[PDB]
């Protein structure tokens, strides 16, 4: 069924995770035809500035994520940054996420595939849609069986990303496709010390994604984005999540009749 | 508001071709009463890549052919102009005067179109940013235009390729009605060397995206037999497929409409 | 010999043209191994804003340009915007310039070629280097014998241009190549009502052009760019023209040994 | 200041290959005394497009091979790291630790390199704007790096293509020494499908542009027989052509140097 990956960008505290997890659990009960996966990074290993928030470490993160899965019975997903992290993360993560900048790092992909867990690779901003075929092949070689590719924008001049929706049907040829609705509108290094983005385009573009056809969507959501320690300009207010989900489900219901085969 | 569907053969290959397509558009106009159809065809392809490619049979012949379509089917008409002097004779038949993408910044062409009193539709240049169109609309208003459209037809993305940045739709809506060009947006500029190429398999998915995001109309080139077209043979939609596409976009528009943001 | 096309962007007044023409005449006498061509537009037909400076009309412009050619004996070049302008402009213009946005307008190219004059086409920001082969063919079909292609940057994301220097050797296969040193650093619509640009990159990039190899350079020059009615952010101060010319001639002298054949 | 020339075979195909190339680099180092040569070769291509492409013979073998080059020829050494743990063993032989382009934002990798006390050269990501490198240098300085280089190797321009924006050289010079990668800048990412392509005919002209604009050094992959290389077979410079290229860039650098702007 349709996948909805959502949660706060970074694990600012297990408290934050629980509050968001409580809402995702509620929507999970309201939208039975949707498979929700809770997401949150234990480390922002690629911040632009050395002085920006990274996190509380892998152990605290994996612990907080365990709390969410045990308390709400929600599937989990988080990203890894170096090969050694795959094993400990797989203890809780149902889906191991591979960062966009690291989508070509062979050992990271193999490490993730070896855990036996599902793997979701963020398509690098430097990659062409057809270049992802090789990515999937590495994962299959590594033993991965459940593989996802996430569209999160492509480099378009400086400090800007564009979403080429032709990528959805192209990547669908070799993997399930997820559309990252929040990172696709961010402006890389847009604010000098941090990245920017236009929240006003999150909804319009997610509607486009389901109209074109995808297997799921990815959304960063925070109770108060303004106070977020990461992606404060792009995380979706928690309260607006329900409305957006219902909206894309309705559009998908009507549009699905026209999704092209393979 | 009434959704606009601008459709027709890319170029006026013959008056016979126009009537053939016009007959089908008229039929669909009777079925899709909630749609405002505008028949489109260029009397001249003034910017072909090669000197050896088809251009047309001249303005006189073209306007005459377009007038036959309006007279026989009662359909609104739109065609593009390339130089200022063409605005006047074209306004005689064209309900909407179209400004080519490469010429979207040519002040005199825009002014010539605006003073005719007809509606003006400007194809957004492949070199233009969405917010850059505000000044285009300003020039038109200055010139007397009261009904203005801006058409999204892709942006230069590396060589011989265009990308559609859908953020352009809500941005341009701030100052004009917005049209999505479903066929030119998938063309590969100069892709075939002496001519441009294209990927027809992406026409439908991208048009679904356009209506889900929200626009005021769509623009589609359509030909009975695309493979035999004298221009854009790789991107024109087979006429037989037009009905189905229109029905689909009306359905997606309806379900997504309650979510369209207010500008 | 090496071509240097220079002059004020727009014909703000025949007075401005004479002052600039006087300096270009002086450099012409100092650099005998260089063929100088005086340039200035009688009309800026593609300004972003309807309220920006366009010019004083074709007649006044052609007249002022005649004054420059007669008073200083300098070759002339100006751009045309519609087919009817080719004939009257050819009365004075040694080289007819075709605007970047209009490089694909067949009738404009043919009109220019019919005059018997040399034709310099600005490569559209939307054109690939190899797409210019067709441009030259149209001109040859139209009777043109002296044909130039000018590199002036390519669309790179929004409101920015990048100079792909690979274009120089590619275009050289079918025409003489000119590098536009001033427009290549302009930021299209950068200031909302007008375009922007970084003057600091004019010199570095022109050095690159001659190191790679070209048949000439194009430079907008004004006594006081700050007061210019067009491209105030990119026109080169008249006083700096001599130094730049000597510099590129020196670099060309050494680098020419390595220019690849054809 | 002494111009830097970083050169060597893309990958450590064998210790024999390294000595062969090292011998030539040593010879040129004796002729071009005004140049500081640094021998380069990767012990691992950790980011090949295909799982079936050559990667290397491991870190242990590679460091040993590089040490043989330094020992036998007295040349400085540089190689790239892919994960934090590799910094320490690599620092034992590498005078300059290289950070791959895709990993230019990985904080721990940069920190691991900085604390070794060795010089660090970061390949500018194809996704990074020139001014975005200021923060890269800041992280390195924070981590203890005292000798920092930023390498221009092209920027994503549409699909499977890179463009070199030479404005990056003077911009990056504001906070670090700048190196121009003459061979990777002409490669076509994923161009050959299972591997990347490239246009060797543009290597020389673009390197001439780099020195005319002004940089602190150049980076060139060089192999005795490029067509037989196990990586970048389409872009590595034939070893026989290295001498001529170096002489040419030194000549162009000399004549253009009086015009280099002050940062
Ligand atoms: O704000 P900066 O530090 O640029 O980081 C961008 C974040 O969006 C980043 O860590 C993201 O999740 C990774 O690409
Ligand atoms: O096939 P070529 O001649 O490149 O022309 C492309 C057509 O698509 C052309 O007339 C177009 O819509 C105009 O820009
Ligand atoms: O400043 P704006 O009006 O954008 O004009 C850009 C000028 O550089 C322009 O007329 C140029 O000479 C044409 O492209
Ligand atoms: O040929 P493929 O595997 O695409 O690899 C490209 C090489 O050019 C590669 O290892 C490169 O410099 C790394 O990014």
DSSP C119-130: EEEEPPTT--GG
Technique behind this structure? Answer: X-ray
Radius of gyration for the alpha carbons in chain B, expressed in angstroms and rounded: 17
CB C186 within 8 A of CB C229: no
Q: Which of A191, A233, A46 is nearest to D136 (CA)?
A: A46
Residue A170 contacts residue A127 (beta carbons within 8 Å): no
- Partner residue opposite A50 with nearest CB, options D125, D126, D138: D138
**Cβ within 8 Å of A, B 143-162:** 155, 157
Closest-CA distance of chain C to residue D93, Å: 36
DSSP single-letter state for residue C260: P
| Cβ neighbours of residue B168 closer than 8 Å, sequence gap 6 or more | B124, B130, B152, B155
Whether the CB of D47 sits within 6 Å of ligand 4? yes
Token representation of residue C236: 């080169």
- With contact defined as beta carbons under 8 Å apart, do B28 and B246 qualify? yes
Cα(B248) to ligand 4 centroid in Å equals 43
DSSP SS3 for D78: strand
Total domains in the fold of chain A = 1
Q: Using CA atoms, how far apart are residues B77 and B67, in angstroms rounded to an integer?
A: 8
A215 CB-contact burial (10 Å; exposed 0-12 / middle 13-18 / buried 19+): middle
Residue D200 corresponds to which tokens in the numbers above? 């060797």
The neighbour count for residue B20, using CB atoms within 10 Å, is 14
Alpha carbon distance D106, D84 (integer Å): 10
- Residue A30: CB atoms within 10 Å: 11
* Chain centre distance of CA A24: 15
In whole angstroms, give the CA distance from residue B169 to residue D86: 48
The pair of structure tokens assigned to D53 is: 């492409």
| Atom 5, ligand 3: residue with shortest CA distance | C47
d(CA B255, CA B250): 9
Per-residue H/E/C for D225-237: CHHHCCCCCCCCE
How far apart are the C-alpha atoms of D205 and C159, rounded to whole Å? 27
C-alpha distance from A153 to closest chain C C-alpha (Å): 13
Whether the CB of D187 sits within 6 Å of ligand 4: yes
Distance D180 CA to ligand 4 centre (A): 17
For residue B83, give every residue at least 6 positions away whose Cβ sits within 8 Å of its Cβ, in sequence order, or none: B109, C82, C83, C107
B134: domain CATH number is 3.20.20.70
C-alpha–C-alpha distance, residues B183 and C51, integer Å: 34
* CA separation for the pair A104, D46 (Å, rounded): 8
| Separation in Å, CA B113 to CA A215, C81, D220 | 46, 16, 56
Paired sense of beta strands C186-187 and C196-197, if any: antiparallel
Phi first, then psi: what are they for B164, rounded to 5°?
-105, 115
- Please state, in angstroms and rounded to a whole number, the distance separating the CA atoms of residues A13 and D154: 39
Q: d(Cα D110, Cα D145) in Å, to the nearest integer?
A: 9
Q: Is D50 helix (H, G, I), strand (E, B) or coil?
A: coil
Q: What is the DSSP string of A129-197?
A: GGGHHHHHHHHHHTT--SEEEEE--EE-SSS-EE--TTHHHHHTTTSEEEEETTGGGEETTTTSSS-EE
**Tokens in use for A173?**
């040829």
Report the candidate in A198, A223, A215 with the shortest Cα–Cα distance to residue A252. Answer: A215
- The pairing of strands D162-163 and D155-156 is antiparallel
Mutation to probe ligand 1, out of A48, A77, A182 (largest number of atoms < 8 A from CB): A48
Report chain A's C-alpha Rg in angstroms.
Answer: 17
Q: H or E element: which one contains D141?
A: helix D133-142
Residues A177 and A149 sit within 8 Å (Cβ to Cβ) = yes
Task: Give SS3 for A48.
Answer: coil
Resolution (Å units): 1.8
Measure the CA–CA gap between A261 and B228, rounded to whole angstroms: 27
Query: C-alpha distances in angstroms, A243 versus A15, B253, C9?
Result: 24, 18, 54
Burial profile C168-199: b = 16 or more Cβ within 10 angstroms, e = fewer: bbbbbebbbbbbbbbbbbbbbbbeeebbbbeb
Q: What tokens were used for A218?
A: 């990815």
Length of chain B: 263
Quote the CA–CA distance of B9 and B21 in Å, as a whole number. Answer: 7
Sequence-ordered list of residues with C-beta below 8 angstroms from that of B22, at least 6 positions apart, any chain? B8, B39, B69, B72, B73, B75
DSSP-derived 3-state class of residue D29: helix
CB A9 within 8 A of CB A231: yes
Q: Rounded CA gap, C160 and C197, in Å?
A: 9
Phi, psi of A32 (to 5 degrees): -65, -25
| Residue C217 DSSP label | E
* Chain A residues within 8 A of C156 when measuring between CB atoms: 157-158
Q: In angstroms, rounded to a whole number, what is the distance separating the alpha carbons of residues D1 and A66? A: 56
Which tokens go with D100? 């791959």
With 0-12 / 13-18 / 19 or more C-beta atoms within 10 angstroms meaning exposed / middle / buried, residue D190 is buried
Contact B82 C107 (CB under 8 A): yes
Interstrand relation of D187-188 and D155-156 (parallel, antiparallel or unpaired): unpaired
Do C204 and D211 lie within an 8 Å CB cutoff? Answer: no
Among protein residues, the one whose CA lies closest to atom 14 of ligand 4: D47
**Contact of C106 with B48, CB cutoff 8 Å:** yes
Q: Are A246 and A34 in contact (CB under 8 A)?
A: no
CA of A53 to the centre of ligand 1 (A): 10
D151 within 8 A of D121, measured Cβ to Cβ: yes
Quickly tell me which residue has 């101060």 as its tokens.
C237
Q: Is D217 on the interface with C (CB under 8 A)?
A: no
Residues D136, D142, D143, D144, CA torsion sign: positive
Q: What is the 3-state secondary structure (H, E, C) of chain B?
A: CCEEEEEECCECCCHHHHHHHHHHHHHHHHHCCCEEEEEECECCCCCCCCCCCCCCCCHHHHHHHHHHHHHHHCCEEEEECCCHHHHHHHHCCCCEEEECHHHCCCHHHHHHHHCCCCEEEEECCCCCCHHHHHHHHHHHHHCCCCCEEEEECCEECCCCCEECCCCHHHHHCCCCEEEEECCHHHEECCCCCCCCEECHHHHHHHHHHHHHHCCCEEEEEEECCHHHCCCCCCCCEEHHHHHHHHHHHHHHHHHHHCCCCCC
Percent helix, percent strand, percent coil in chain D, to nearest 5: 40, 20, 40
How far apart, in whole angstroms, are the C-alpha atoms of residue C52 and residue B123? Answer: 22
SS3 D123: strand
CA distances, B57 to each of B40, B43, B44, B54 (Å): 16, 7, 7, 9
Residue C98's Cα: distance from chain center in Å?
A: 9
**D76/D36 Cα distance (integer angstroms):** 9
Under DSSP, the state recorded for C182 is: T
CA angle, C190 then C196 then C197, to 5°: 125
What 3-state DSSP class applies to C246?
helix
Whether chain B has a CB inside 8 Å of the CB on C48: the answer is: yes
* Closest ligand to Cα A43: 1
Cα distance between residue C63 and residue C67, in whole Å: 6
* Nearest CA distance, C148 vs chain A (angstrom): 28
Task: Answer yes or no: are the C-beta atoms of A10 and A44 closer than 8 Å.
Answer: yes
Q: How far apart are CA B204 and CA A131, in angstroms?
A: 23
Query: Which residue pairs from B248-253 have beta carbons closer than 8 angstroms and sit at least 24 positions apart in sequence?
Result: B248/A257, B248/A258, B248/B204, B248/B208, B249/B207, B249/B208, B249/B210, B249/B211, B249/B218, B250/B3, B250/B32, B250/B34, B250/B35, B251/A254, B252/A211, B252/A251, B252/A254, B252/A255, B252/B208, B252/B211, B252/B212, B253/B3, B253/B211
Count CA atoms closer than 13 A to D150's CA, side-chain side. Answer: 31
Q: Tokens 């790092």 belong to which residue? A: A105
- Residue showing tokens 């087919």: C83
Helices within C115-232 (DSSP H only): 132-141, 167-171, 202-212
Q: Nearest to residue C96, comparing CAs of C64, C119, C122?
A: C119
For residues D200 and D233, the answer to whether their CB atoms sit within 8 Å is no
Q: Are the beta carbons of D196 and D168 closer than 8 angstroms?
A: no
Q: Which segments of chain C does DSSP mark as H helices, in order?
A: 14-30, 58-72, 86-90, 106-114, 132-141, 167-171, 202-212, 241-255
Which residues in B lie closer than 8 A to residue A156 (C-beta atoms)?
157, 163, 165
Closest ligand 1 atom to Cα of A231: 8
Give the relative orientation of helices A202-212 and B203-213 as an angle to the nearest 10 degrees.
140
Compute the distance from residue B107 Cα to the ligand 1 centre, in Å.
Answer: 42
C-alpha span between D113 and D98 (Å, rounded)? 8
Q: Which domain holds residue A20?
A: 1-262
> With an 8 Å Cβ cutoff, are D166 and C205 in contact?
yes
Look up residue C145 and give its two tokens: 């014998």
Q: How far apart are CA A76 and CA A28, in angstroms?
A: 13
DSSP state for residue D42 in the 8-state scheme: B
Q: Which of A167, D158, D159 is nearest to B156 (CA)?
A: D158
> Which among C142, C147, C135, C148 is positioned nearest to C114, based on CA atoms?
C142
- For residue B195, how many C-alpha atoms fall within 13 Å in the half-sphere facing its CB? 14
**H runs (alpha helix) in D143-198:** 168-172
Q: At what angle do helices D242-257 and C202-212 cross, to 10 degrees?
A: 140
C236 CB-near residues (< 8 Å, 6+ apart): C181, C182, C199, C202, C219, C220, C221, C222, C225, C244
CA-to-CA distance for B98 and A66, rounded, in angstroms? 60
């Amino acid at each position: 069924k349709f996948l909805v990956i959502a949660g706060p960008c970074a694990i600012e505290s297990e408290e934050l995770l629980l509050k968001v997890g409580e809402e995702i659990k509620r929507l999970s009960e309201k939208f039975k035809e949707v498979e929700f996966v809770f997401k949150s990074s234990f480390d922002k290993a690629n911040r632009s500035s050395i002085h920006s928030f990274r996190g509380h470490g892998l152990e605290y993160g994996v612990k907080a994520l365990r709390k969410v899965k045990e308390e709400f019975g929600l599937k989990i997903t988080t990203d890894i940054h170096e090969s050694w992290q795959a094993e400990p993360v797989a203890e809780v993560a149902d889906i191991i996420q591979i960062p966009a900048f690291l989508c070509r790092q062979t050992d990271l992909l193999l490490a993730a595939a070896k855990t036996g867990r599902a793997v979701n690779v963020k398509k690098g901003q430097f990659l062409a849609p057809w270049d992802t075929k090789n990515v999937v092949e590495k994962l299959k070689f590594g033993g991965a069986k459940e593989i996802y590719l996430t569209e999160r924008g492509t480099t378009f001049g400086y400090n800007n990303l564009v979403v080429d929706f032709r990528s959805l049907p192209i990547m669908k040829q070799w993997a399930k496709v997820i559309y990252d609705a929040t990172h696709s509108v961010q402006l890389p290094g847009g604010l000098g010390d941090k990245s920017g983005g236009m929240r006003e385009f999150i909804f319009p573009l997610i509607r486009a994604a389901v109209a074109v056809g995808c297997d799921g969507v990815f959304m960063e959501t925070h109770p108060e984005p303004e106070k977020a320690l990461s992606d404060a300009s792009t995380q979706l207010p928690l309260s607006q999540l329900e409305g957006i989900i219902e909206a894309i489900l309705e559009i998908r219901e009507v549009a699905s009749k026209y999704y092209e085969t393979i």
